[PDB]
Design an enzyme around this catalytic site. Structure first.
Site, PDB file in Angstrom:
ATOM      1  CG  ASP A   6     -14.341  -3.171   1.562  1.00 25.41           C
ATOM      2  OD1 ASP A   6     -14.141  -2.586   1.907  1.00 25.41           O
ATOM      3  OD2 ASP A   6     -14.425  -4.102   0.373  1.00 25.41           O
TER       4      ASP A   6
ATOM      5  CG  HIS B 107      -1.875  -0.758   0.844  1.00 25.55           C
ATOM      6  ND1 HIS B 107      -2.934  -0.894   0.024  1.00 25.55           N
ATOM      7  CD2 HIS B 107      -2.699  -2.088   1.647  1.00 25.55           C
ATOM      8  CE1 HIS B 107      -4.001  -1.620   0.330  1.00 25.55           C
ATOM      9  NE2 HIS B 107      -4.079  -2.614   1.299  1.00 25.55           N
TER      10      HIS B 107
ATOM     11  CG  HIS C 226     -10.774  -5.007   1.157  1.00 24.56           C
ATOM     12  ND1 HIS C 226     -11.376  -3.769   2.166  1.00 24.56           N
ATOM     13  CD2 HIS C 226      -9.758  -5.700   1.786  1.00 24.56           C
ATOM     14  CE1 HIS C 226     -10.129  -3.153   2.789  1.00 24.56           C
ATOM     15  NE2 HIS C 226      -9.109  -4.826   2.369  1.00 24.56           N
TER      16      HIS C 226
END
Ligand code: XYP
Ligand code: XYP
Ligand code: XYP
Ligand code: XYP
Ligand code: CA
Ligand code: CA
Ligand code: CA
Ligand code: CA
Ligand code: ZN
Length: 316
Positions: free
Chosen positions: A226, A146, A231
């Protein structure tokens, strides 16, 4: 801290013994000076103040149960650093050997890990859904990736760009797991997920539908949960990446696999040269095709397999 570089030893979350690079100055600190500008591991002491205290140990031996999450966060940060340096010629997540900082023992019973824009953070889990999450090398590499993404493509963490962001982290998390070559698989989080249930994982790249995640664009989640399913819809890209590397026939579309190393080169080039903060799935396809073209030529099998894989998951 300023001190002399030395080598300690301890056991990780899964009970395996490993050496770790530490720094000696009165105490032995989880500070690895052998990689870039340092890898630093901190103790959050079950609270949410970050980063916490730089991990201090009196004898350079880390065999206590309380030590294990720190051992693995520290050690697997080093493995991930090695992967990006040795495989992609990238020095830490910013390309200029930024210090890598990790905090463990975050909060109480915290069933997650994350990159907070400046560092990695690992919960201990509640002992049922998770054990300490730094025990999973694919988790550690997932989060540090990330950071790589934040410093390169900058994919916004919502909708399709956010699902690409997630898939990139699952892809290179998995490729780091294969790089270290200890029980490697195309599953996510298996080493720290549900200690009482064997053979499961948090996500599957080989078969996302195993856990209710879409494996085709027609099945993409379009709600608001989400951050728009970052995800969830990652499964579509994870499947494409799995097909590029391993091959297969998916919804009747056949893909010739080209192997993990070429998957990594293609997607790393896409991530660092062609993707932008707002890239969508179709733009990812074009980026991967162009990357494969750069590396292997427009008429190559590699370019062909990238096209087949995105066709297979319905991304035009
Ligand atoms: O699960 C945690 C465990 O990893 C640690 O070793 O001791 C405290 C627990 O909360
Ligand atoms: O038992 C733990 C100990 O291992 C650590 O050093 O300090 C915190 C305690 O909870
Ligand atoms: O060790 C304990 C830990 O398991 C829990 O998370 O918070 C209380 C601590 O004393
Ligand atoms: O999400 C579904 C899961 O709940 C079931 O157990 O197996 C098939 C999956 O699609
Ligand atoms: Ca000790
Ligand atoms: Ca594994
Ligand atoms: Ca895995
Ligand atoms: Ca399990
Ligand atoms: Zn993530």
């Amino acid at each position: 801290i300023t001190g002399t570089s030395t080598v300690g030893v301890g056991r990780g979350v899964l009970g395996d013994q490993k050496n770790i690079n530490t720094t000696y100055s009165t105490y032995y600190y989880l500070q690895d000076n052998t990689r870039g500008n340092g890898i630093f591991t901190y103790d959050a002491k079950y609270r949410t103040t970050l980063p916490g205290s730089l991990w201090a140990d009196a004898d350079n031996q880390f065999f206590a149960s309380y030590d294990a999450p720190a051992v693995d966060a520290h050690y697997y940060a080093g493995v991930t650093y090695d992967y990006y340096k040795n495989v992609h010629n990238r020095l830490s997540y910013d390309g200029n050997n930024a210090a890598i900082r990790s905090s463990v023992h975050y909060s109480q019973g915290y069933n997650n890990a994350f990159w907070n824009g400046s560092q990695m953070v690992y919960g201990d889990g509640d002992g049922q859904t998770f054990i300490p999450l730094s025990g999973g090398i694919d988790v550690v590499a997932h989060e540090l990736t990330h950071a790589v993404t934040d410093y390169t493509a900058g994919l916004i963490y919502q909708n399709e760009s956010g699902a690409i962001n997630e898939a990139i982290s699952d892809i290179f998390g998995t490729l780091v797991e294969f790089y270290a070559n200890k029980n490697p698989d195309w599953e996510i989080g298996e080493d720290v997920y549900t200690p009482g249930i064997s053979g499961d994982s948090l996500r599957s790249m080989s078969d996302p539908a195993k856990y209710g995640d879409p494996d085709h664009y027609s099945k993409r989640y379009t709600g608001t949960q989400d951050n728009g399913g970052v995800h969830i819809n990652s499964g579509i890209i994870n499947k494409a990446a799995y097909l590029i590397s391993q091959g297969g026939t998916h919804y009747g579309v056949s893909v010739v696999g080209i192997g993990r190393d070429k998957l990594g080169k293609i997607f790393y080039r896409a991530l660092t040269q062609y993707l932008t903060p707002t890239s969508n799935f179709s733009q990812l396809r074009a980026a991967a095709v162009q990357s494969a073209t750069d590396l292997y030529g427009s008429t190559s099998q590699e370019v062909a397999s990238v096209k087949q894989a995105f066709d297979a998951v319905g991304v035009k």
